[PDB]
Amino acid sequence: ALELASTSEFRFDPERTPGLRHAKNLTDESTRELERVLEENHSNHHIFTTTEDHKGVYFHNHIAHHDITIWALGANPSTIRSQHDRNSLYQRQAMVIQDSVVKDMADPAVYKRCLGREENFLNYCRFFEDEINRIGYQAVLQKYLVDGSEIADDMLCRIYMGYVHGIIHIGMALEFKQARLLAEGFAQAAVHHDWWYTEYLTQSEELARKQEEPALPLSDLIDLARQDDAIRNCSTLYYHLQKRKVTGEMCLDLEPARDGVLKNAGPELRRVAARYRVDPNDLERATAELQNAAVYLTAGAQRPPHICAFDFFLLHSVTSSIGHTMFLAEPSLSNAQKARLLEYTGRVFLLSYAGQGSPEPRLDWLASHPSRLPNQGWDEVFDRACYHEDDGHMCKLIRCMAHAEETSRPYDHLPEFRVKQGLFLTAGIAAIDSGTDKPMDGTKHFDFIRGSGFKEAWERFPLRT
Ligand SMILES: COc1cc(O)cc(C)c1O
Numbered sequence: 001a002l003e004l005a006s007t008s009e010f011r012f013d014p015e016r017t018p019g020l021r022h023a024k025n026l027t028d029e030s031t032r033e034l035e036r037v038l039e040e041n042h043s044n045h046h047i048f049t050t051t052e053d054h055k056g057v058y059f060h061n062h063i064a065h066h067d068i069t070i071w072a073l074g075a076n077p078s079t080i081r082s083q084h085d086r087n088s089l090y091q092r093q094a095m096v097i098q099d100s101v102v103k104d105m106a107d108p109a110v111y112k113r114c115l116g117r118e119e120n121f122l123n124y125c126r127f128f129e130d131e132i133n134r135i136g137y138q139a140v141l142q143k144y145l146v147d148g149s150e151i152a153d154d155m156l157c158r159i160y161m162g163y164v165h166g167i168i169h170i171g172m173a174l175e176f177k178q179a180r181l182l183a184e185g186f187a188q189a190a191v192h193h194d195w196w197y198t199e200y201l202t203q204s205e206e207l208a209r210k211q212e213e214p215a216l217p218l219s220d221l222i223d224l225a226r227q228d229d230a231i232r233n234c235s236t237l238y239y240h241l242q243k244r245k246v247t248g249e250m251c252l253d254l255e256p257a258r259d260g261v262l263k264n265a266g267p268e269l270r271r272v273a274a275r276y277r278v279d280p281n282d283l284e285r286a287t288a289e290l291q292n293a294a295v296y297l298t299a300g301a302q303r304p305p306h307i308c309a310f311d312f313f314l315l316h317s318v319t320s321s322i323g324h325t326m327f328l329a330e331p332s333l334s335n336a337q338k339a340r341l342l343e344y345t346g347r348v349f350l351l352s353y354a355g356q357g358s359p360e361p362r363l364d365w366l367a368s369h370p371s372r373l374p375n376q377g378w379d380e381v382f383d384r385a386c387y388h389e390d391d392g393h394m395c396k397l398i399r400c401m402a403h404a405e406e407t408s409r410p411y412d413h414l415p416e417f418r419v420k421q422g423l424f425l426t427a428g429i430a431a432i433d434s435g436t437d438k439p440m441d442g443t444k445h446f447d448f449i450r451g452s453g454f455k456e457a458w459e460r461f462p463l464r465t
């Protein structure tokens with residue numbers, strides 16, 4: 001049973017809540033500043049930084065993830081404040097809380113009616129805080145995620161919507177033991193409305209029931225997707241180059257999964273997805289194997305002769321993967337429930353990977369990455385990640401690869417673990433080495449590649465010297 005901080009406040013402690021992987025000596029001073037900025041973010045900022053029509057899809061508020069991650073990697077108070085303040089500048093104003101709606105949401109008809117509507121984000125936050133206090137967080141995980149009710153089944157698909165930001169939030173809430181962040185996570189999922197995740201995950205689970213072909217590790221199913229004509233050709237770099245006809249502004253009016261993968265290769269991908277069936281009696285290894293496979297498909301997506309670069313879309317597989325360590329540690333979940341969670345996450349990794357062009361892994365090119373700086377261990381990389389001026393993706397990727405190295409170490413001898421122990425630090429050095437002095441402009445990212453599986457995506461990336 002986790003000892004969660006109160007639904008009504010953020011309370012961190014360098015020894016009680018440092019998470020699964022962290023810097024050596026965390027200060028009280030940094031912890032107090034983190035609690036300050038988290039509450040400013042919760043009360044003042046919306047879960048989405050854009051309106052849906054602005055760029056075509058929602059952009060997400062990463063401030064909770066970034067602040068918490070750089071605290072965990074040993075950021076000083078001044079650095080936490082500087083990073084938080086810069087990312088605050090492009091936020092939307094928080095929605096209004098209507099207490100009557102928060103109470104009425106106890107009627108399942110009302111709960112259902114409010115789903116997918118971003119104006120309900122703080123209403124759901126309060127509804128889930130109230131649920132945590134009424135029945136306890138463990139009963140919340142049953143009722144809103146794994147107990148197999150129509151409401152839990154609906155929410156289990158929503159945590160993956162919007163490039164898996166719901167399950168990232170939920171993972172971080174369990175890892176850092178914050179009931180207030182757990183309610184934020186369910187609320188985030190509740191207000192998404194990416195209907196194609198419900199269809200894909202529902203149809204894939206039904207197909208999996210039939211057990212038509214043997215189960216494979218995720219690493220093997222990543223490889224199988226590339227052999228398929230329909231899957232390997234189902235997407236285009238055009239999703240990352242589309243412009244608004246009038247203004248020439250960037251948009252995602254067409255979306256790789258909805259308009260590409262599921263339109264051109266639905267049956268073929270569902271046939272692969274259907275083979276990711278996890279053994280409820282082998283979850284320590286199956287959880288580590290999913291985490292290794294995320295590093296495999298992400299850090300592996302390299303193209304000689306370019307510098308190492310990380311794909312913005314693919315790295316959500318690495319950052320989402322850490323939460324399964326907490327799901328594994330949770331007594332109140334059955335082995336079958338923990339298996340079903342891993343299955344959903346893996347099938348989404350396959351969908352994301354196909355949308356970016358199913359990049360063929362080049363671990364040989366990754367392994368030869370020349371370190372920009374000498375004598376770089378994880379502690380040196382962690383400290384550099386604190387100062388990297390994006391919205392948190394770089395530091396989350398680095399901390400989650402460092403976690404995966406640790407969960408892989410018992411299994412380094414097994415063939416289904418493609419990423420071997422020394423390559424995790426090389427990948428972390430490659431990530432921070434790809435960073436520039438100006439990684440973002442407002443909400444736009446420059447340091448990450450988009451469409452790693454398409455040769456032309458690499459044109460703006462320098463050659464390795
Ligand atoms: C900040 O850039 C992004 C955030 C996000 O949540 C989703 C997309 C597609 C972004 O480009």
Ligand SMILES: [Fe+3]
Binds near residue numbers: 060062165316393
């Ligand atoms: Fe993200």
